[PDB]
Design a protein around this ligand. Structure first.
Ligand SMILES: CC(=O)N[C@@H]1[C@@H](O)[C@@H](O)[C@@H](CO)O[C@H]1O
Ligand SMILES: CC(=O)N[C@@H]1[C@@H](O)[C@@H](O)[C@@H](CO)O[C@H]1O
Lengths: 171, 171, 171, 171
């Protein structure tokens, strides 16, 4: 139960995550939604992405010393959304300028010469639908690429090609 | 006009469904949701489940000569909802007394023993929530076991037992 | 056997009911009858009542979004008994405890400071009489007031006074 | 600042309630609120209203054999809010569809052709305010009239008009 019409999100407890120690709140409602990639390994099964989420999060917690996996939500090619910091705790995905003002959903893998399956693009869009439903996102939310906000190669050539197609994508 | 925010469904193309030849339309809103099991093999990868999807569909088309897979939606252990007949077409699944007034969803497997995984339960609940938001189901909706409406073990002793707890289950 | 001889009931057809969508049934022989009032306006001609019965049903299925008027029968100040959900299908007129084990005859009007005409009192005792003969009520059924099982004023102060008189009444 | 800062609810003990035997739990935050009226006599002294609260409570516990007064909270014309079964316990006030997803506040008296004092109206809105402050009510909660969800005259045409006025009132 993560309040009405919330498009199937795999809870933290389910992907065996460590406890977030993040105390910073996100002044709701969020306007921007920054899309990124982990540039890490990709996975096509629920089984292997729950390990992959673990991988991404321990690297953020044990090694870089943050309080939690830096993204608000991680997306798998297995077609599911893995819950990271969720809708309320502030992200660490795009720099001081955007972290307090936007949500970061990141696709799990490297997308320079690989495209993500439709099942995971479907997942992402359906995450945003529920975003609005709960009111964490403003019906009129804007979708920028990681490129758009920071000197970075991510989300990756082939996915920056597609997110551009998305109705809410602002230039 | 009225979709608050829906859910993520694997459309027929993606699972490579034979063309539907059904024409009987279900009258909107529907009031009854009937939960059942295919009592066949289970699957936890999006790849195998797209296969299992074709299996149920074809045994129902090439052997029972029905116009399409019997269910409206199919539920995978992969955590995904597969599109069968959808929200608009009557689809053979619980007797002529119930087929025209209920939507039939079916977890893919024999849950006589085994419980389906949390993500499959989420996949289905989110699916009904989408139904209400789309206006295809009514807020009122009643979930019913396959066994409650016709003489069979069908939801599965252990799955039936779970759906008894759900918010909307009536006698 | 021995023609039951009690049907002076106006059919769902004759008063123009919307089609019912209810399917849950009662087990005959049924043990309790619960008397309520519609607390709305009363009618005295068979023309004005078919109007009232259509109206009550409208408020049950259009407003509350119910499968059909919740009462099993409806008595009119016209002297006639109106088919509601009938002898077999389970009504929705007194809570989850009594609903499954009782008939819900309700007088159409507000009997707080009125008495229902004798011709109605008589149609009611007649109905119950019929129920015993068809076998739908136990020879020795128990009558009860709506207020006896719910915090309401139904079936009206003065009518409640009259039914406490009836031979099949029980606290 | 922002602590609880709740209103003033006369506790059970002060009005000498009988021991609550109810055990079911509402799961906060609650989305719905239903406004009823006891449809009995009103009161305007904290002393006389404490009298009423026990009446209602005994009719509910020893006549209907219920585990506590049906309502969660009782508004009084003395200007105090009388604790019924509280913010946490499933109340019995509007059928099995709404009792588990809502909180029942009932104005002590009968408001067919009588408006409640401003005192009252302020007590009940303070109660709701307090209720969001505590996480017991969802911020975007909806208020419905009793009759809006059950065939009943309650809360009274007068009070019903007052409450469609309220923001949070829906359908
Ligand atoms: C450790 C590291 O640098 N990770 C970055 C990642 O954050 C993203 O910017 C990606 C874009 O292609 O490049 C990666 O190298
Ligand atoms: C072939 C066969 O036995 N089919 C039954 C089916 O009719 C139903 O009873 C179902 C209930 O779960 O179990 C199946 O095994």
């Amino acid at each position: 139960e993560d309040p009405p019409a919330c498009g199937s999100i795999v809870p933290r407890r389910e992907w065996r995550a460590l406890a977030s120690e993040c105390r910073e709140r996100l002044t709701r409602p969020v306007r921007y939604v920054v899309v990124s990639h982990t540039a890490g390994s990709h996975c096509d099964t629920p089984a292997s992405c729950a390990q992959q989420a673990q991988n991404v999060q321990s690297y953020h917690v044990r090694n870089l010393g943050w309080c939690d996996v830096g993204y608000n939500f991680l997306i798998g090619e297995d077609g599911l959304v893995y819950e990271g910091r969720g809708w309320n705790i502030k992200g660490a995905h795009a720099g001081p300028t955007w972290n307090p003002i936007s949500i970061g959903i990141s696709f799990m893998g490297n997308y320079m010469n690989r495209v993500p399956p439709p099942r995971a693009l479907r997942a992402a869009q359906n995450l945003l639908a529920c975003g609005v439903a709960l009111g964490a996102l403003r019906s009129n939310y804007e979708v920028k690429g990681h490129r758009d906000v920071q000197p970075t190669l991510s989300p990756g050539d082939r996915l920056y090609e597609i997110i551009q197609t998305w109705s809410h994508y602002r230039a």
